[PDB]
Design a protein around this ligand. Structure first.
Ligand code: NDP
Ligand code: PLC
Ligand code: PLC
Ligand code: PLC
Ligand code: SF4
Lengths: 440, 451, 175, 359, 115, 88
């Protein structure tokens, strides 16, 4: 039952027990003291053993753990050191973003998306910008889509540095964490020069970007590109061929390609299992068709494979950054429609038509024609998509966000079952969890 | 934030839209209603909004000497009862006066409190020389616009019985002017001389001018009119010859048959207060000159201001309940703050008999309560507790008063088979300053620029 | 009984040292506060996007370790608690359990908008509107997210407060 | 508490100020008062301050310890809880906490004299200065807390000074002042209980033979709250105590039995029979060698004096509150210090109490 | 994937009688864990008190009529059982669950402000 | 309509009884909002003049499509309500 619980040899009929001084029944009322007179052997499988159900050691991999990328009450049920069942408790960071967007305009709802994933900002707001652009039936000009491709790559480098190095740090390699974080400081300079804030760059707005690139940014972006090429090499020096790094990750968290599709995994934990699918290729967008790059596909579906794919994503992203700097076109950076973009300040105070649209954009907002859409992009974690329903109003009606880290954490039970408690950290690290995105 | 409610300055009760901001009303705009106003409101209504931001009574007040002091509700509801039995008023020594802006829920609920203490010196703050109203609260048709507003554009002859429609109902004044342009409209002036947007078939200034009207060509066209109009302003009952007015006219309404058809009623009233019709539809008026002569020892004012000609005894106990500090407030002894018309759900009745309520916009300022809620609160302090414990029950009481009181935005008329029986009962411009008419206008800083 | 309390004797934070004991117990306070001023060990309570900045202080560009700052995971080993990120209702009971386990002395720093007064999610059905409803706070760092220097500035101001502690002189003069 | 503490939304104080409360009684509501709670950082203050702030009354809490005032600000909203640094020897700082105050509460009271203050200087000298200074600033109401056995002629220093504290206030603040006498309160970290839970309690037989009338500290916390919002309760004397009579020795064995503390009580030091001169000598010696407030000579005398109810005063029911018994709350407050937990319910305390009295 | 302790499939029951028996077993399950809820959450109320409150909870809403709304009330009550037995709610929430809770005349409500 | 759905919506007990919802029409669709509270709807904060409020339904408006659709909803939730007919 709920609180406690209760054959090969032949069932042998023995009756008529006798001793040398009488029968079994003659001394029955006295033999309980005589331990050598008992008739219930203790080796019998049918012997009544009633033992209380003492629950197994359930350690809380709870919020106050450095391995956690947020506040995760990972209720782990373990016997010994193996993993029996895992039940993550997401929601400790449910800020209710989906509820708040319904009451704010399409321009005011953009800064919510930078706060989903703390590290992949300009990719997050790109998927809402594309969603609104798809409904608005307006297309960003060429130079706008090249800026989104360049900062699409820089964001991927920023995200993967947080993902790979913390995964390396959580294993125990402290040094590669600090070498890479200087590069993030160097990369966050580029975010701050174009947008103003280091981390949450409300830059990619529906209808292009916020402001044109500052002069000389390309020179500084390219100069970092030459130096950055060595940074991966030293990262691959202390991780790629080290035997301790291989032992911690090889064969840890095996995910079949057929089973990865079943749980809807996307991103690195779908090419780690061998499927050569990539959203940047399946649905080209924002000047990704123009550039050329090679996708990476694993063969064993374990953490070490996903590491190699993520490291390859560094060089392939750096490959595009060279192409985006070289192939940069001239022109505007946002759609030249005053109804979906603020007019320049030189013209707002000179032209009566310009001032009216500036006044009207910021008080009522632009109205999105009715419809519904589901646009998915290759986020650094995986397939990130938003389901947006337009009710002809200047405020979206329904905004459901597909978080790649949300689905992956669900497949923790399928992946981590049968591994050891140290392998739990490796599995979490390779999932690239950011519980702001999980609990959107 | 917008709310749809009604004006209380005049007796039209036109539909308006109020745009508030938190706990302050910013502007009032008209909301379309072809039945009453149709996009027009006078400058008085829309520029008296700021009158609710000053002079407000926010606390109970108690007189100690000759200056009011800030006192709680516990003491205020007791100082009335404490001094109530110090003087021990008799049956006719208790008086109640209801103001122009007092809502109908307080008007009905006050009678129950008054009756359980045995008094009948209750009426409005008018100056009707005849102690019972000349038209009388007996029948609805005696004091209502039986035509209603939507039955003016199809009239031929209109009689102004001592009135200034420009200064008495601006919305309807232009309605007559709009008809007067294209139609063959004929309007004759019988009353004090004035200045109008349009000329009239002017006669004179005396009552004896009307004596030769209904029998000459002035009244012959009234017989000729398929839909003739007779209008009696709020300035008639005040006059000395108010009794002569109804007998003279209703004799002309009981004579012809084209005046009163199954589709038309040629006789109407044009009051100017938003509480007179509500009073008459509930019988909140006296019916004896002797009772109006009593030197009452306890006069309980409920929104009443125009009481200068009302003989308030100096030794009497005067309690004023309202939402402003004005003429009626000085006479008080213990003041109970009420509620502004926008701050309450008050059921009002206009001069055409239409029952229009209000939707609450803001909370009452300070620690003010609802108008009637004080009376029931005051009831427990006098042993005359009323059985009404929520606003629905106050409307439940209105069900016993009449069936039309519970029909929102629905007008119950007087049937042609009975309104003629009510006709059988019968057989100087009242307003000085246009911008000083009601309590809110007098305290409005804006109207200080209209003088 | 006999009692006579003066009136011009000043408050502790304004009272100058007069005798030699007032210099002895000021030495103990500075020496003891200098230990806590330098060995400033917060707790890694990163919750949301504000947590990225708290990592970048440890990054080689700023290197919190140079100032004697070594984050300690366990509350027992940590004398500070930098509450960074949104504090949801589902977390608030847990946050109080973590705070109450810090041995005295203990300080709390509220970094970012969410920890201060609600921030972006102030009108959310499941967001505590300011962590000050749950734990006392000694310094508020404003930002979204506060720059890595803004947190260091907030750390420095709290350090300047700790160096103003006068506990062992308080026993001598105010107790 | 419930939902809104004020009896009426508008309350006029003795000074003519007309205070209007707003809101439905939440954290973001207000009451328009300003209750300066002297000694708010103490055991009793943290209950007095907490109740006043949550209902919207501004609290000005004068403190002398900087690190103890931080936790008092959680209770109120922004600007509700204010702080003033002060000392009883700094008159100017006293007048900073009463300038805007409509309610002044006095909780300052000590049992041990220090190298800076005597028992009189605090229960009188602080109280006299606080009360007289509050009057000069037009404070409408004063509330005071004294001992439960105040007596001007008592040989105990605490009771003698606390009694004179009642007189000196009424000669300074005037007829408006109120005096409230609380019985030994029991709550989390209550000084009344902290002596009973201590394992090494020298002179345990002598100290614990005293008698008391224990009262729940929450009710006394609300008792001041009820008095604060009412002007009808000026110039009174209130003694607050619990119905069922308990003695420390009855409690000490009752406390120990819940914690299940054979040989251990005889060895760890639960019962330490020591000579009366030794107890008197030990307290005197520590009085010059200790640095933290220890057992005092005064509490050696108080152990011989039992609690006395004064009939001139008024009980809880005068305020409309029924006092709660130690039986319904004694277990939970020692639950921190205690297979299957046995919860000693309200009635079962007697059955525990029965087991103590049986020889 | 392996479902957690004390889990049941979400099923739309299409019988009036079966739902009656499902509830009855459920009420016993709460009473069986009466001792645990006291020891797990360290509640101040003894075991008999919890059963008294549980009975007050089950007695309260026994008169519902809609079967489509019977399953919903049985589904969510199952979650309350699963959350409580698995020791998921924090200590504070259970303490406040049992710590929740006659009106006043019109004069009393008129004076202070009513609602 | 006959269903006591209020036991599954999780709404507080006060919505069923002490609140009134208006079904109005601002010009092609209908809306539902709750009438303001008697007291405590809006009090001026004494610190910074913020428009405080205890009513949690002040900011809620539901955009409907047809009148009978709105009435169906109000009966489904067990909401007290009244209907305001627009002027022609
Ligand atoms: N159940 C109980 O606790 C008992 C209640 N009482 C009496 O009730 C009253 C409330 O005191 P209580 O809170 O319970 O216990 P505490 O001793 O902890 O209260 C002392 C309060 O007064 C302050 N205080 C003491 N001396 C000074 C001083 N020279 N200068 C400034 N402040 C001083 C303290 O400041 P700080 O703490 O910040 O240093 C503290 O705020 C006391 O008089 C107490 O004797 C009677 C018997 C027992
Ligand atoms: C071995 C021990 C060496 C101690 C080293 C730390 C010094 C210290 O703690 O010095 C700090 C303290 C106090 O500060 P101050 O600047 O003197 O305060 C006084 C400020 N006046 C002078 C401007 C008023 O100084 C001392 O009490 C000095 C005596 C102790 C040596
Ligand atoms: C044996 C035990 C182990 C070793 C003990 C020593 C541990 C470290 C001590 C830290 C001291 C500290 O922190 O002193 C530095 C602090 C920091 O200045 P501040 O806090 O801003 O105040 C100072 C400014 N005022 C006072 C105007 C506000 O004060 C001082 O400048 C103290 C004054 C300098 C003292 C120099 C003379 C004494 C020399 C003694 C050594 C021979
Ligand atoms: C280890 C020795 C501890 C000595 C304590 C002491 O010297 O204390 C002696 C006295 C007592 O004062 P107190 O301890 O604050 O009294 C309050 C505490 N009671 C009520 C328990 C007594 O104070 C002094 O003259 C302090 C002079 C400073 C001496 C240098 C240290
Ligand atoms: S304050 Fe801004 S950066 Fe910090 S947690 Fe909140 S949303 Fe993120």
């Amino acid at each position: 039952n709920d609180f406690y619980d209760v054959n090969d040899f032949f069932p042998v009929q023995v009756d008529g027990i006798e001793s040398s001084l009488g029968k079994y029944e003659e001394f029955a009322k006295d033999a309980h003291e005589w331990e050598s007179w008992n008739l219930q052997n203790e080796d019998h499988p049918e012997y009544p053993v009633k033992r209380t159900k003492i629950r197994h050691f359930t350690l809380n991999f709870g919020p106050q753990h450095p391995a956690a990328h947020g506040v995760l009450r990972l209720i782990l049920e373990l016997h010994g050191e193996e993993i029996l069942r895992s039940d993550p408790h997401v929601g400790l960071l449910h800020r209710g973003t989906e509820k708040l967007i319904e009451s704010k305009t399409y321009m005011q709802a953009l800064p919510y998306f930078d706060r989903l994933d703390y590290v992949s900002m300009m990719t997050n707001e790109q998927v809402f910008s594309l969603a609104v652009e798809k409904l608005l039936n307006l297309e960003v000009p060429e130079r706008g889509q090249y800026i989104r491709t360049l900062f699409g790559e820089i964001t991927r480098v920023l995200n993967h540095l947080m993902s790979v190095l913390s995964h390396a740090m959580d294993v125990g390699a402290l040094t590669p964490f600090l070498w890479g974080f200087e590069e993030r400081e160097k990369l966050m300079e580029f975010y701050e020069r174009v947008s103003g804030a280091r981390l949450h760059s409300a830059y990619v707005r529906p209808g292009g970007v916020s402001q044109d690139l500052p002069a000389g940014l390309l020179d500084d972006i390219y100069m970092w590109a030459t130096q950055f090429g060595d940074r991966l090499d030293e990262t691959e020096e202390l991780l790629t061929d080290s035997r301790i790094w291989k032992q911690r990750t090889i064969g840890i968290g095996e995910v079949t390609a057929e089973d990865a599709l079943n749980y809807g995994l996307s991103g690195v934990m779908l090419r780690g299992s061998g499927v050569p699918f990539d959203i940047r290729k399946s649905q080209p967008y924002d000047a990704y068709d123009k550039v050329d790059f090679d996708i990476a596909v694993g063969t064993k579906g374990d953490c070490y494979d996903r590491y190699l794919i993520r490291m390859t994503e560094f060089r392939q992203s750096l490959r595009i950054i060279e192409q985006c700097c070289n192939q940069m076109p001239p022109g505007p950076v946002k759609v030249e429609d005053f109804k979906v973009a603020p007019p320049p300040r030189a013209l707002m105070k000179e032209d009566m038509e310009a001032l009216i649209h500036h006044f009207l954009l910021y008080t009522k907002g632009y109205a999105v024609p009715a419809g519904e859409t589901y646009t998915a992009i290759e986020a650094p974690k995986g397939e990130m998509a938003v389901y947006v329903v337009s009710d002809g109003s200047e405020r979206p009606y329904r905004c459901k966000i597909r978080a790649p880290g949300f689905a992956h954490l669900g497949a923790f039970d399928h992946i981590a079952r049968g591994h050891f408690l140290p392998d739990a950290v490796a599995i979490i690290g390779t999932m690239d969890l950011v519980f702001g995105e999980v609990d959107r | 934030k917008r709310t749809e409610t009604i004006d209380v300055h005049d007796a039209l009760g036109s539909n308006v839209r109020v745009d508030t901001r938190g706990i302050e009303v910013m502007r009032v705009l008209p909301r379309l209603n072809d039945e009453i106003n149709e996009e027009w409101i006078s400058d008085k209504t829309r520029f008296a909004c700021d009158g609710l931001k000053t002079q407000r009574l926010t606390k109970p007040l108690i007189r100690q000497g000759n200056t009011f002091v800030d006192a709680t509700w516990e003491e205020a509801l007791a100082t009335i009862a404490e001094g109530f039995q110090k003087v021990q008023p008799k049956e006719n020594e208790i008086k109640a006066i209801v103001g122009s802006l007092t809502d109908l829920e307080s008007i009905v609920a006050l009678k129950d409190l008054v009756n359980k203490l045995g008094s009948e010196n209750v009426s409005t703050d008018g100056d009707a020389t005849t102690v019972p109203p000349a038209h009388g609260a007996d029948f609805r048709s005696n004091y209502i616009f039986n035509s209603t507003i939507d039955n003016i554009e199809e009239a031929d002859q209109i009689l102004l019985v001592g009135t200034n429609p420009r200064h008495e109902a601006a919305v309807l004044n232009a309605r007559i002017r709009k008809v007067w342009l294209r139609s063959d409209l004929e309007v004759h002036h019988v009353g004090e001389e004035f200045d109008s947007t349009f000329e009239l078939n002017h006669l004179g200034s005396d009552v004896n001018a009307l004596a030769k009207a209904l029998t000459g060509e002035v009244g012959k066209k009234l017989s000729e009119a398929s839909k003739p109009l007779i209008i009696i302003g709020s300035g008639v009952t005040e006059t000395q010859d108010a009794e002569a007015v109804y007998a003279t006219v209703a004799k002309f309404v009981t004579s012809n048959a084209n005046i009163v058809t199954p589709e038309w009623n040629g006789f109407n009233l044009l009051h100017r207060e938003a509480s007179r019709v509500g009073a008459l539809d509930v019988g909140f008026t006296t019916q004896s000159p002797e009772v109006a002569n009593t030197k009452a020892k306890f006069i309980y004012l409920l929104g009443a201001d125009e009481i200068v000609n009302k003989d308030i005894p100096k030794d009497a106990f005067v309690v004023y309940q309202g939402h402003h500090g004005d003429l009626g407030a000085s006479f008080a002894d213990v003041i109970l703050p009420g509620s502004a018309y926008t701050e309450k759900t008050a059921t009002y009745v206009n001069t055409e008999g239409r029952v229009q309520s209000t939707r609450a916009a803001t909370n009452p300022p300070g620690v003010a309560r609802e108008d009637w809620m004080i009376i029931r609160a005051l009831s427990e302090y006098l042993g005359a507790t009323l059985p009404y414990d929520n606003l629905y029950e106050m409307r439940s009481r209105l069900a016993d008063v009449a069936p039309h009181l519970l029909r929102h935005e629905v007008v119950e008329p007087v049937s042609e088979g009975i309104a003629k029986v009510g006709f059988q009962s019968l057989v100087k411009n009242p307003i000085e300053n246009f911008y000083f008419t009601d309590v809110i206008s007098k305290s409005s800083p804006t109207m200080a620029k209209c003088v | 009984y006999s009692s006579d309390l003066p009136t011009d004797i000043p408050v502790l934070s304004k009272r100058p040292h007069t005798n030699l004991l007032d210099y002895t117990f000021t030495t103990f306070d500075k020496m003891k506060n200098w230990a806590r001023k330098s060995s400033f060990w917060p707790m890694t309570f990163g919750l949301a996007c504000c947590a990225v900045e708290m990592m970048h202080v440890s990054a080689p560009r700023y290197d919190q370790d140079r100032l004697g700052i070594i984050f300690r995971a366990s509350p027992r080993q940590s004398d500070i608690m930098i509450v960074a990120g949104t504090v949801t209702n589902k977390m608030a009971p847990a946050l109080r359990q973590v705070y109450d386990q810090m041995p005295y002395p203990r300080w709390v720093i509220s970094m970012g908008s969410c920890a201060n007064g609600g921030g972006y999610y102030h009108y959310s059905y499941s967001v505590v509107r300011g962590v000050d409803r749950i734990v006392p706070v000694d310094i508020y760092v404003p930002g979204c997210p506060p720059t890595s220097e803004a947190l260091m500035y907030g750390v420095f101001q709290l350090q300047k407060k700790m160096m103003d502690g006068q506990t062992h002189r308080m026993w001598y003069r105010s107790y | 508490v419930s939902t809104f503490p004020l009896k009426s939304d508008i309350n006029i104080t003795k000074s003519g100020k007309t205070l209007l409360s707003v809101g439905q009684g939440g954290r973001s509501s207000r009451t328009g008062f300003t209750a300066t709670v002297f000694g708010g950082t103490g055991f009793l203050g943290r209950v007095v301050v907490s109740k006043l702030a949550k209902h919207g009354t501004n609290v000005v809490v004068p403190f002398r310890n900087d690190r103890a005032r931080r936790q008092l600000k959680v209770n109120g909203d922004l600007g509700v809880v204010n702080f003033v640094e002060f000392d009883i020897r700094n008159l100017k700082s006293i007048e900073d906490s009463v300038k805007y105050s409509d309610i002044v509460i006095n909780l300052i009271g000590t049992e041990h004299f220090s190298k800076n203050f005597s028992i009189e200087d605090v229960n009188i000298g602080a109280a006299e200065r606080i009360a007289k200074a509050a009057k000069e600033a037009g404070v409408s109401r004063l509330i005071h807390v004294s001992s439960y056995n105040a007596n001007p002629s008592s040989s105990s220093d605490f009771y003698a000074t606390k009694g004179i504290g009642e007189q000196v206030v009424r000669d300074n603040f005037g007829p408006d002042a109120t005096i409230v006498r609380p019985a030994p309160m029991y709550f989390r970290n209550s000084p009344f209980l902290n002596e009973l839970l201590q394992i090494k309690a020298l002179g345990g037989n002598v100290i614990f033979k005293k008698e008391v009338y224990p009262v729940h500290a929450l009710q006394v916390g609300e008792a001041i709250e009820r008095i604060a919002f009412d002007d009808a309760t000026a110039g009174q004397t209130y003694e607050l105590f619990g119905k069922e009579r308990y003695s420390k020795k009855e409690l000490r064995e009752m406390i120990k039995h819940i914690i299940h503390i054979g040989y251990y009580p005889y060895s760890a030091g639960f019962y330490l029979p020591a000579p009366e001169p030794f107890l008197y000598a030990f307290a005197l010696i520590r009085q010059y060698i200790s640095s933290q407030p220890r057992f005092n000579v005064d509490q050696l005398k108080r152990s011989h004096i039992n609690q006395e109810i004064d009939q001139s005063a008024k009980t809880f029911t005068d305020l409309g509150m029924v006092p709660d018994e130690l039986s319904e709350y004694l277990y939970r407050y020692v639950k921190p210090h205690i297979q299957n937990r046995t919860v000693y319910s309200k009635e079962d305390i007697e059955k525990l109490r029965d087991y103590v009295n049986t020889p | 994937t392996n479902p957690t302790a004390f889990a049941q499939t979400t099923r739309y029951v299409k019988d009036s009688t079966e739902m009656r028996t499902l509830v009855l077993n459920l009420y016993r399950r709460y009473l069986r864990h009466s001792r645990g809820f006291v020891n797990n959450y360290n509640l101040d109320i003894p075991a008999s008190q919890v059963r008294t409150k549980i009975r007050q909870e089950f007695e309260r809403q026994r008169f519902v009529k809609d079967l489509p709304l019977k399953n919903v009330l049985y589904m969510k009550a199952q979650m309350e059982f699963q959350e409580l037995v698995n020791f998921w709610k924090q200590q504070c929430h259970v303490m406040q669950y049992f710590e929740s809770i006659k009106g006043d005349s019109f004069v009393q409500k008129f004076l202070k402000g009513a609602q | 309509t006959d269903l006591a759905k209020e036991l599954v919506s999780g709404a507080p007990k006060e919505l069923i009884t002490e609140r009134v919802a208006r079904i109005y029409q601002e010009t092609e669709t209908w809306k539902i909002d709750w009438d303001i509270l008697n007291k405590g709807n809006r009090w001026e904060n004494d610190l910074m003049g913020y428009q405080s409020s205890s009513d949690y339904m002040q900011g809620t408006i539901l955009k409907f499509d047809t009148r009978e659709g709105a009435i169906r909803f109000a009966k489904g939730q067990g909401w007290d309500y009244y209907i305001q007919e627009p002027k022609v």
